Amino acid sequence: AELKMDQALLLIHNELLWTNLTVYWKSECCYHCLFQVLVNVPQSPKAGKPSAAAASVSTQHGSILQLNDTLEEKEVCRLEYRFGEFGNYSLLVKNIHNGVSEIACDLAVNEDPVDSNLPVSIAFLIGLAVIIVISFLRLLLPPRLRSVDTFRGIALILMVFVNYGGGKYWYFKHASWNGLTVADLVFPWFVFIMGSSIFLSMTSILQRGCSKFRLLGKIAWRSFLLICIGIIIVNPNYCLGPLSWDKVRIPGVLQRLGVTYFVVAVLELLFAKPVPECLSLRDITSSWPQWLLILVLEGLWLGLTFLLPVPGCPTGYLGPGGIGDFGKYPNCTGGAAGYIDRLLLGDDHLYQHPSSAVLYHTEVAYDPEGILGTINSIVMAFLGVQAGKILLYYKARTKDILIRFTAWCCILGLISVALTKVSENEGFIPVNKNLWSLSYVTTLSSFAFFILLVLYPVVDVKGLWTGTPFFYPGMNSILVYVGHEVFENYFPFQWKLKDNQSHKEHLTQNIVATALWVLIAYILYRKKIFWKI
Amino acid sequence: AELKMDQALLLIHNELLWTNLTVYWKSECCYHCLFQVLVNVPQSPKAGKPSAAAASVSTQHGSILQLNDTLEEKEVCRLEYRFGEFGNYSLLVKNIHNGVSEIACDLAVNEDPVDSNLPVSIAFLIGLAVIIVISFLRLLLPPRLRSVDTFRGIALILMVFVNYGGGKYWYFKHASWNGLTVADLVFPWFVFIMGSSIFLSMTSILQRGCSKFRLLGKIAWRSFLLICIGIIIVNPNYCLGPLSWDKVRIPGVLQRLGVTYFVVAVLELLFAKPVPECLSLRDITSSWPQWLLILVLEGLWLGLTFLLPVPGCPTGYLGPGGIGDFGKYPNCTGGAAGYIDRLLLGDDHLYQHPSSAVLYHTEVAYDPEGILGTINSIVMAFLGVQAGKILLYYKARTKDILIRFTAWCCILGLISVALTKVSENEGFIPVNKNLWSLSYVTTLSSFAFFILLVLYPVVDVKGLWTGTPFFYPGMNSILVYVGHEVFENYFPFQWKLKDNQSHKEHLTQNIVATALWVLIAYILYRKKIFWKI
Ligand SMILES: CC(C)(COP(=O)(O)OP(=O)(O)OC[C@H]1O[C@@H](n2cnc3c(N)ncnc32)[C@H](O)[C@@H]1OP(=O)(O)O)[C@@H](O)C(=O)NCCC(=O)NCCS
Ligand SMILES: CC(C)(COP(=O)(O)OP(=O)(O)OC[C@H]1O[C@@H](n2cnc3c(N)ncnc32)[C@H](O)[C@@H]1OP(=O)(O)O)[C@@H](O)C(=O)NCCC(=O)NCCS
Ligand SMILES: *[C@@H]1O[C@H](CO)[C@@H](O[C@@H]2O[C@H](CO)[C@@H](O)[C@H](O)[C@H]2NC(C)=O)[C@H](O)[C@H]1NC(C)=O
Ligand SMILES: *[C@@H]1O[C@H](CO)[C@@H](O[C@@H]2O[C@H](CO)[C@@H](O)[C@H](O)[C@H]2NC(C)=O)[C@H](O)[C@H]1NC(C)=O
Ligand SMILES: *[C@@H]1O[C@H](CO)[C@@H](O[C@@H]2O[C@H](CO)[C@@H](O)[C@H](O)[C@H]2NC(C)=O)[C@H](O)[C@H]1NC(C)=O
Ligand SMILES: *[C@@H]1O[C@H](CO)[C@@H](O[C@@H]2O[C@H](CO)[C@@H](O)[C@H](O)[C@H]2NC(C)=O)[C@H](O)[C@H]1NC(C)=O
Ligand SMILES: CC(C)CCC[C@@H](C)[C@H]1CC[C@H]2[C@@H]3CC=C4C[C@@H](O)CC[C@]4(C)[C@H]3CC[C@]12C
Ligand SMILES: CC(C)CCC[C@@H](C)[C@H]1CC[C@H]2[C@@H]3CC=C4C[C@@H](O)CC[C@]4(C)[C@H]3CC[C@]12C
Ligand SMILES: CC(C)CCC[C@@H](C)[C@H]1CC[C@H]2[C@@H]3CC=C4C[C@@H](O)CC[C@]4(C)[C@H]3CC[C@]12C
Ligand SMILES: CC(C)CCC[C@@H](C)[C@H]1CC[C@H]2[C@@H]3CC=C4C[C@@H](O)CC[C@]4(C)[C@H]3CC[C@]12C
Ligand SMILES: CCCCCCCCCCCCCCCC
Ligand SMILES: CCCCCCCCCCCCCCCC
Ligand SMILES: *[C@@H]1O[C@H](CO)[C@@H](O)[C@H](O)[C@H]1NC(C)=O
Ligand SMILES: *[C@@H]1O[C@H](CO)[C@@H](O)[C@H](O)[C@H]1NC(C)=O
Ligand SMILES: CCCCCCCCCCCCCC
Ligand SMILES: CCCCCCCCCCCCCC
Ligand SMILES: CCCCCCCCCCCCCC
Ligand SMILES: CCCCCCCCCCCCCC
Ligand SMILES: CCCCCCCCCCCCCC
Ligand SMILES: CCCCCCCCCCCCCC
Ligand SMILES: CCCCCCCCCCCCCC
Ligand SMILES: CCCCCCCCCCCCCC
Ligand SMILES: CCCCCCCCCCCCCC
Ligand SMILES: CCCCCCCCCCCCCC
Ligand SMILES: CCCCCCCCCCCCCC
Ligand SMILES: CCCCCCCCCCCC
Ligand SMILES: CCCCCCCCCCCC
Ligand SMILES: CCCCCCCCCCCC
Ligand SMILES: CCCCCCCCCCCC
Ligand SMILES: CCCCCCCC
Ligand SMILES: CCCCCCCC
Ligand SMILES: CCCCCCCC
Ligand SMILES: CCCCCCCC
């Protein structure tokens, strides 16, 4: 069954004789949202025979219930509660006769819920036990940077886990509009790593004497391939039917990577300078044309986001539309970003399932990989380029690399704190993956600099760790990505489940599929099969 | 719409006043079948106002119509006609008053049909024009046998064309029960070529000093991979949902190839002898244990096919069931072959769409790649092994190879003539791809020996032709096969058509997809990417 996943059963008994109750529901996660009708509860026909109604409430977040007298449109009582999954609760609405004529509604638990996050806890404990067992058991018995491969492999393992379902948990899934979950981390990290690799490969190629025009042809060919593979292979759902142009989605992940790669790689190619050999700022000073153009692009993004007038919609709007912001702007999902996407591409060539559609009930199409957020993708990739420049300019001195990584992490973290005001929905620019906002970029690039600060000495300098098992996927990232897209529905990545409303079975299936992709990458590494676009 | 593909419109006007007509229809292709009701036509309410009914008739083959008085169950008139696609015909049933009281029904053509095969004729003319233009334009300006690669590439091009739809023509599609179409040629040819390659590779490996146990491990590994790829990747339709065991089809194409390869390769490994150096019979005499075991297997197939009793079903039954054979054995599709498949695997693990379901209206599941026809697959592969033995034993002398190929083609053709009596449905053993009958094997192996007889001197000895563009697919057969299975629904192999009832649009789409697969194979050949199981 009667209940789906992440749902409880609520039974309302109305003991009032002369009032018709309507119960509205609102999630605590939904910001400035409208109350939606949950169930209508009729009046009690007789004393001692309360009228009963049943409803399913979502248990992912806290709930707010408002019981309003239908005839008078007046509030009877209000209730805030976090219901548990598969719980059985009853809400009794009676008038207290102890010298008053008020109404007191109180909530009781008929049947206790289940612990929804127990499979996650057990999976983490099992994984930690495996790590400890392997470590102790084995204890009793230019080249490629291994830390960048380890970082890319970590991002790939997370991407495969969350794309395949993430156990159907809300925190292994994209945030509705604002904030961060685990699913929102990996795409900016791919952009950052791609920028780092741009600098590393380009510097290696140019020091060996290759011409700039041959390298330009290489860049153009790779960008074209990325965009075409994204449009033709990854975006369409061919289980629904043959491709028709009028419903072809033009933007996407590999399209974003292709355009960002082209712009950043050509920008580095134009002003490429040789790497020379404690207090120096030459990695920043020697590339001031790049920085000037990046700040001009960021100024353009801020200007179009906060000052471009959108017809019939507020200027500077950063919300989701739908029922959000008290339903005043239902069709305004995205603000100027969505407006530009709909104006230049049309609604039929955009993403038809924005992540805001489930919490804010948005009805317009919005594409997270739209046109306006490509500016911030370019900013993220250029920050990755700076990470690569630190790695090569101060390659001899580990102390300089660590200080530079620490300083960049601190500066970007302070900018994120200033922009977000350390809050999900407040702040001048909240963190938003759909908009690819500025604070999203600064936050995730601060995380990336911290990750490099930890991985570089451990994996590359000291040698305490080889990166297993992450550098195996990290060296076949395009094969793993295109592969898990193509073979998403195939066995053994996906089989028929006994219970589709079970977190345990979904989690087990997704963990097994992720481990299988890591094993495939390991086999490809052993046989020295590597593909690069 | 009003009409589908390969359908005409028939209008029946009943001028009789006291008779109710029922019209039954029967195809000429359907052998010993029951008449099925086409349309019921009521009596004429008044003189001069004939009652009218409309029906769609199939235009692929000739039609037989029987108009029976419904009350008396007596035949009024019978009519044989080949209707044309999208034609508009009217059938008038009136009683002739010229001194008689009989009924004369005559058929008129209101609107002429279309030429359904015109796209095929135009495609052939365009292809021939391209060949002539290229030939004249270019005229004005151990190793691998190229003829075997050309043969495999021809089979692959035909397989991709007919699997992708074949233009939706009935002759580019599998025969219902008996006979041959173009779609029925390529699978036996793959088995034949695989046997030839077994002998060639095994002889090459054993002359270089490799041990027999390492080669046995190679054979077992390759067979296991073929069977697993068939079951897990090729057989399931993952557009319908995640894999469930109770509806997993166990047999299939690569499963047949894996089992046949294992048996034939191990049989050659056991009795492998070195190749020695006009009237000799040593290619046949030196492998008499293989021939003895092959004849024992063929005796087993004949015995189980003609003498195994099947419960509630005739012994030796070779028909399709359904409405065939006058509907006396509706559930007997396959005879003993289908009985063994259903007994050992169960109906749920068999093919659910046998080719007989459309013409004979069979309702049971029958699997063309079943257990009993593996014997005849093994016979086909062993005939391919004989072709390889001829190629290597008499490699020095082209004249000996040509005489041996001619003799084998003639013997197998004479056996096919004796078995089939040169007829689709008569003969002791008719040609049947579903049953993998003996005459099917002898006929297709005779064709294969003739193909080799033509290709070997032209491509390998004289050098008049390099095999373009067939040897490019012929060197990546497993990639092309698994690839066209995985990417069948993807663009550019498949797009949305303006008219799904058009032979021209389906044919154009399928030709384009086949050419794209040939181009992919050419690109893989240029970059020296070859995959072998
Ligand atoms: C597209 C994608 C392959 C980008 O690749 P990348 O980060 O540029 O890494 P590549 O393997 O392409 O590296 C290209 C170059 O960088 C160099 N490089 C890569 N890793 C390196 C390392 N650790 N050390 C030194 N050099 C390195 C390579 O040598 C190569 O140079 P070459 O052209 O001279 O051979 C990868 O990000 C991807 O798969 N995208 C998925 C996006 C995604 O999943 N987003 C999440 C939502 S689904
Ligand atoms: C499965 C399949 C790849 C069989 O392969 P095959 O015909 O045995 O050819 P392979 O490429 O596997 O050749 C294997 C060996 O034969 C040798 N060989 C192949 N072609 C050769 C030639 N022309 N000359 C000499 N040797 C050859 C190879 O060198 C190889 O030897 P090695 O293992 O020592 O390297 C192929 O039949 C197939 O794709 N099956 C599809 C079935 C089908 O589509 N049926 C129709 C219904 S869809
Ligand atoms: C439930 O009833 C309350 C009344 O107590 C409603 O609150 C009022 O809503 C109107 C909008 O129609 C506002 O103009 C008033 O300012 C609100 N008053 C207060 C005290 O909040 C509430 O809107 C009703 N719930 C729903 C879902 O309509
Ligand atoms: C939720 O809990 C209530 C308990 O209040 C269940 O209602 C009981 O159901 C049993 C079996 O049908 C009856 O014997 C009791 O008389 C019921 N009690 C009341 C107070 O109604 C209800 O069935 C539970 N719901 C689910 C889905 O389990
Ligand atoms: C149409 O009517 C004819 C009668 O002329 C049927 O033919 C007879 O069918 C019965 C079966 O019920 C046989 O026993 C007779 O031997 C048949 N007689 C002849 C002369 O053929 C015919 O079956 C009817 N058509 C259909 C579809 O039932
Ligand atoms: C098939 O042909 C008949 C001609 O006999 C068409 O019937 C004619 O339809 C037109 C337009 O509706 C009428 O003006 C004529 O009076 C009809 N003639 C008769 C004799 O009925 C019929 O429409 C055609 N069917 C199709 C699908 O094209
Ligand atoms: C020079 C570029 C690359 C970077 C800076 C671009 C900025 C300054 C541009 C881009 C979009 C522009 C805005 C677009 C539209 C309007 C609405 C109009 O009623 C007043 C001007 C105003 C508000 C513009 C002000 C300037 C603006 C914000
Ligand atoms: C060789 C001897 C000294 C054993 C070395 C212990 C290894 C296995 C331990 C010690 C320090 C550990 C690292 C410390 C911090 C991080 C955190 C995170 O970013 C990924 C894991 C990573 C990178 C750890 C991986 C495992 C690790 C490298
Ligand atoms: C020795 C093997 C490998 C090859 C030859 C097998 C032949 C001779 C076998 C296989 C199947 C057998 C048949 C299976 C079942 C029956 C039904 C029974 O009422 C009479 C015997 C009869 C008709 C058998 C006769 C012999 C038979 C035809
Ligand atoms: C080099 C000069 C002499 C030109 C040679 C002409 C070539 C292109 C011609 C001449 C004979 C032709 C072959 C003769 C017979 C067959 C029939 C069929 O099984 C496939 C095509 C094939 C194999 C032909 C392909 C094209 C062919 C090889
Ligand atoms: C969050 C998802 C967790 C998935 C776990 C993946 C890691 C397990 C890898 C198993 C394959 C090991 C191959 C390398 C052997 C050296
Ligand atoms: C019966 C289907 C016919 C399909 C035609 C396929 C042959 C055309 C091949 C085109 C690709 C040429 C690549 C080789 C160039 C040397
Ligand atoms: C409650 O709703 C029912 C449904 O029609 C209505 O008949 C009844 O009058 C309502 N009661 C009050 C007090 O409004
Ligand atoms: C023809 O069929 C109709 C349909 O019920 C029936 O009423 C009529 O009596 C039949 N005519 C004859 C002659 O049987
Ligand atoms: C949903 C709340 C968003 C919080 C954004 C991140 C705040 C912290 C800034 C980064 C600190 C740097 C630590 C590596
Ligand atoms: C090889 C000598 C130097 C030539 C300059 C190369 C410039 C390459 C980037 C400029 C092209 C930009 C295309 C949009
Ligand atoms: C030497 C090969 C050159 C190939 C050129 C391809 C042109 C397409 C350019 C794609 C640019 C995409 C980012 C805007
Ligand atoms: C010295 C060799 C020169 C090679 C020239 C290749 C140039 C390719 C340029 C592609 C530009 C695409 C811009 C969208
Ligand atoms: C409620 C969601 C908690 C997790 C949010 C993601 C932020 C923290 C994990 C990312 C840290 C990466 C290393 C700096
Ligand atoms: C000469 C320096 C050798 C490497 C020392 C690495 C120490 C710094 C590690 C930073 C990790 C921070 C984790 C909180
Ligand atoms: C549907 C008709 C089937 C006919 C079977 C084939 C008869 C000819 C035997 C093979 C002759 C050999 C020529 C290469
Ligand atoms: C290497 C020396 C000769 C050994 C004989 C090899 C026989 C291999 C085939 C027999 C195994 C059959 C398995 C079903
Ligand atoms: C050296 C590798 C050996 C692998 C052995 C695999 C065993 C599976 C055998 C498959 C036989 C299929 C035909 C019946
Ligand atoms: C000299 C090296 C010996 C290698 C031994 C490999 C033997 C593999 C046998 C597999 C048999 C599978 C039968 C189904
Ligand atoms: C009505 C169907 C006509 C075609 C049937 C297939 C047999 C003839 C073509 C195969 C010949 C292959 C070369 C010997
Ligand atoms: C790289 C651009 C590919 C665009 C694909 C368009 C698909 C068109 C299908 C035609 C049917 C309407
Ligand atoms: C109930 C079905 C469980 C399926 C488990 C999948 C295991 C994958 C390993 C096999 C790879 C081919
Ligand atoms: C090679 C054998 C593979 C068999 C695949 C079985 C799939 C089982 C799915 C479990 C859900 C019922
Ligand atoms: C109406 C749509 C026609 C599509 C034609 C397909 C052409 C394929 C060549 C492009 C390969 C990417
Ligand atoms: C057992 C695999 C490692 C732990 C995965 C945890 C996912 C919630
Ligand atoms: C980096 C400075 C951000 C501006 C602060 C905004 C406070 C509302
Ligand atoms: C134009 C491609 C070659 C001819 C194909 C004919 C298919 C009926
Ligand atoms: C090869 C001989 C076949 C037996 C002839 C059958 C005639 C009905």
Side-chain angles (χ1 to χ4, degrees), chain A residues 147-160:
Chain A
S147 55
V148 179
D149 286 340
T150 308
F151 192 7
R152 199 185 295 109
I154 295 173
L156 279 156
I157 288 179
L158 276 176
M159 161 207 93
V160 175

PDB file of all heavy atoms in Angstrom, chain A residues 147-160:
ATOM      1  N   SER A 147      48.140  11.231  -8.996  1.00  0.00           N
ATOM      2  CA  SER A 147      47.109  11.849  -8.170  1.00  0.00           C
ATOM      3  C   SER A 147      45.953  12.388  -9.004  1.00  0.00           C
ATOM      4  O   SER A 147      44.801  12.342  -8.563  1.00  0.00           O
ATOM      5  CB  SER A 147      47.722  12.951  -7.314  1.00  0.00           C
ATOM      6  OG  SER A 147      48.416  13.888  -8.112  1.00  0.00           O
ATOM      7  N   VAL A 148      46.231  12.893 -10.205  1.00  0.00           N
ATOM      8  CA  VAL A 148      45.163  13.362 -11.083  1.00  0.00           C
ATOM      9  C   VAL A 148      44.331  12.187 -11.588  1.00  0.00           C
ATOM     10  O   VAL A 148      43.106  12.290 -11.727  1.00  0.00           O
ATOM     11  CB  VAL A 148      45.759  14.191 -12.235  1.00  0.00           C
ATOM     12  CG1 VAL A 148      44.674  14.672 -13.180  1.00  0.00           C
ATOM     13  CG2 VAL A 148      46.551  15.361 -11.684  1.00  0.00           C
ATOM     14  N   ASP A 149      44.977  11.052 -11.863  1.00  0.00           N
ATOM     15  CA  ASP A 149      44.248   9.846 -12.246  1.00  0.00           C
ATOM     16  C   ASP A 149      43.409   9.314 -11.094  1.00  0.00           C
ATOM     17  O   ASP A 149      42.291   8.836 -11.304  1.00  0.00           O
ATOM     18  CB  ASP A 149      45.220   8.771 -12.720  1.00  0.00           C
ATOM     19  CG  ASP A 149      45.773   9.052 -14.088  1.00  0.00           C
ATOM     20  OD1 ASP A 149      45.163   9.843 -14.827  1.00  0.00           O
ATOM     21  OD2 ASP A 149      46.826   8.480 -14.425  1.00  0.00           O
ATOM     22  N   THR A 150      43.943   9.365  -9.874  1.00  0.00           N
ATOM     23  CA  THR A 150      43.179   8.947  -8.704  1.00  0.00           C
ATOM     24  C   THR A 150      41.962   9.837  -8.495  1.00  0.00           C
ATOM     25  O   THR A 150      40.867   9.346  -8.205  1.00  0.00           O
ATOM     26  CB  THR A 150      44.081   8.963  -7.471  1.00  0.00           C
ATOM     27  OG1 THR A 150      45.267   8.215  -7.742  1.00  0.00           O
ATOM     28  CG2 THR A 150      43.381   8.351  -6.285  1.00  0.00           C
ATOM     29  N   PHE A 151      42.135  11.152  -8.647  1.00  0.00           N
ATOM     30  CA  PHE A 151      41.024  12.090  -8.522  1.00  0.00           C
ATOM     31  C   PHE A 151      39.957  11.827  -9.581  1.00  0.00           C
ATOM     32  O   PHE A 151      38.758  11.793  -9.272  1.00  0.00           O
ATOM     33  CB  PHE A 151      41.572  13.516  -8.617  1.00  0.00           C
ATOM     34  CG  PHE A 151      40.599  14.596  -8.221  1.00  0.00           C
ATOM     35  CD1 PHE A 151      39.361  14.296  -7.678  1.00  0.00           C
ATOM     36  CD2 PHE A 151      40.935  15.925  -8.392  1.00  0.00           C
ATOM     37  CE1 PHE A 151      38.485  15.294  -7.331  1.00  0.00           C
ATOM     38  CE2 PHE A 151      40.058  16.924  -8.043  1.00  0.00           C
ATOM     39  CZ  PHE A 151      38.837  16.607  -7.513  1.00  0.00           C
ATOM     40  N   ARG A 152      40.372  11.613 -10.831  1.00  0.00           N
ATOM     41  CA  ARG A 152      39.409  11.326 -11.887  1.00  0.00           C
ATOM     42  C   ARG A 152      38.695  10.002 -11.643  1.00  0.00           C
ATOM     43  O   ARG A 152      37.506   9.867 -11.943  1.00  0.00           O
ATOM     44  CB  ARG A 152      40.104  11.332 -13.245  1.00  0.00           C
ATOM     45  CG  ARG A 152      39.157  11.492 -14.422  1.00  0.00           C
ATOM     46  CD  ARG A 152      39.860  11.365 -15.759  1.00  0.00           C
ATOM     47  NE  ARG A 152      40.823  12.433 -15.995  1.00  0.00           N
ATOM     48  CZ  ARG A 152      42.138  12.280 -15.991  1.00  0.00           C
ATOM     49  NH1 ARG A 152      42.695  11.102 -15.788  1.00  0.00           N
ATOM     50  NH2 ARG A 152      42.912  13.335 -16.200  1.00  0.00           N
ATOM     51  N   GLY A 153      39.405   9.009 -11.105  1.00  0.00           N
ATOM     52  CA  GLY A 153      38.773   7.735 -10.803  1.00  0.00           C
ATOM     53  C   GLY A 153      37.776   7.812  -9.664  1.00  0.00           C
ATOM     54  O   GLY A 153      36.747   7.133  -9.687  1.00  0.00           O
ATOM     55  N   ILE A 154      38.074   8.616  -8.643  1.00  0.00           N
ATOM     56  CA  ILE A 154      37.115   8.849  -7.565  1.00  0.00           C
ATOM     57  C   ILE A 154      35.844   9.481  -8.116  1.00  0.00           C
ATOM     58  O   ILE A 154      34.725   9.062  -7.794  1.00  0.00           O
ATOM     59  CB  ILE A 154      37.743   9.726  -6.465  1.00  0.00           C
ATOM     60  CG1 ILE A 154      38.907   9.007  -5.787  1.00  0.00           C
ATOM     61  CG2 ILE A 154      36.702  10.129  -5.442  1.00  0.00           C
ATOM     62  CD1 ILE A 154      39.678   9.868  -4.828  1.00  0.00           C
ATOM     63  N   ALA A 155      36.002  10.501  -8.963  1.00  0.00           N
ATOM     64  CA  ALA A 155      34.844  11.143  -9.573  1.00  0.00           C
ATOM     65  C   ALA A 155      34.050  10.164 -10.431  1.00  0.00           C
ATOM     66  O   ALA A 155      32.817  10.203 -10.444  1.00  0.00           O
ATOM     67  CB  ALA A 155      35.289  12.348 -10.396  1.00  0.00           C
ATOM     68  N   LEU A 156      34.738   9.282 -11.159  1.00  0.00           N
ATOM     69  CA  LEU A 156      34.050   8.312 -12.008  1.00  0.00           C
ATOM     70  C   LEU A 156      33.276   7.289 -11.194  1.00  0.00           C
ATOM     71  O   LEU A 156      32.174   6.889 -11.581  1.00  0.00           O
ATOM     72  CB  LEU A 156      35.050   7.598 -12.909  1.00  0.00           C
ATOM     73  CG  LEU A 156      35.497   8.315 -14.173  1.00  0.00           C
ATOM     74  CD1 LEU A 156      36.831   7.777 -14.563  1.00  0.00           C
ATOM     75  CD2 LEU A 156      34.488   8.115 -15.284  1.00  0.00           C
ATOM     76  N   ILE A 157      33.848   6.824 -10.085  1.00  0.00           N
ATOM     77  CA  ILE A 157      33.154   5.853  -9.247  1.00  0.00           C
ATOM     78  C   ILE A 157      31.906   6.471  -8.634  1.00  0.00           C
ATOM     79  O   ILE A 157      30.833   5.854  -8.617  1.00  0.00           O
ATOM     80  CB  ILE A 157      34.118   5.298  -8.183  1.00  0.00           C
ATOM     81  CG1 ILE A 157      35.136   4.370  -8.845  1.00  0.00           C
ATOM     82  CG2 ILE A 157      33.370   4.582  -7.081  1.00  0.00           C
ATOM     83  CD1 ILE A 157      36.144   3.791  -7.906  1.00  0.00           C
ATOM     84  N   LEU A 158      32.013   7.711  -8.152  1.00  0.00           N
ATOM     85  CA  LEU A 158      30.837   8.411  -7.645  1.00  0.00           C
ATOM     86  C   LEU A 158      29.801   8.630  -8.739  1.00  0.00           C
ATOM     87  O   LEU A 158      28.596   8.499  -8.496  1.00  0.00           O
ATOM     88  CB  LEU A 158      31.251   9.744  -7.037  1.00  0.00           C
ATOM     89  CG  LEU A 158      31.742   9.726  -5.597  1.00  0.00           C
ATOM     90  CD1 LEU A 158      32.203  11.107  -5.199  1.00  0.00           C
ATOM     91  CD2 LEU A 158      30.629   9.252  -4.695  1.00  0.00           C
ATOM     92  N   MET A 159      30.247   8.982  -9.945  1.00  0.00           N
ATOM     93  CA  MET A 159      29.320   9.229 -11.042  1.00  0.00           C
ATOM     94  C   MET A 159      28.552   7.972 -11.419  1.00  0.00           C
ATOM     95  O   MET A 159      27.340   8.025 -11.641  1.00  0.00           O
ATOM     96  CB  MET A 159      30.083   9.787 -12.243  1.00  0.00           C
ATOM     97  CG  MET A 159      29.364   9.675 -13.567  1.00  0.00           C
ATOM     98  SD  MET A 159      30.489   9.594 -14.965  1.00  0.00           S
ATOM     99  CE  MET A 159      30.695   7.838 -15.177  1.00  0.00           C
ATOM    100  N   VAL A 160      29.232   6.831 -11.488  1.00  0.00           N
ATOM    101  CA  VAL A 160      28.542   5.593 -11.830  1.00  0.00           C
ATOM    102  C   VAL A 160      27.561   5.211 -10.731  1.00  0.00           C
ATOM    103  O   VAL A 160      26.457   4.732 -11.008  1.00  0.00           O
ATOM    104  CB  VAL A 160      29.552   4.465 -12.115  1.00  0.00           C
ATOM    105  CG1 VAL A 160      28.834   3.149 -12.340  1.00  0.00           C
ATOM    106  CG2 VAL A 160      30.396   4.806 -13.317  1.00  0.00           C
TER     107      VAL A 160
END
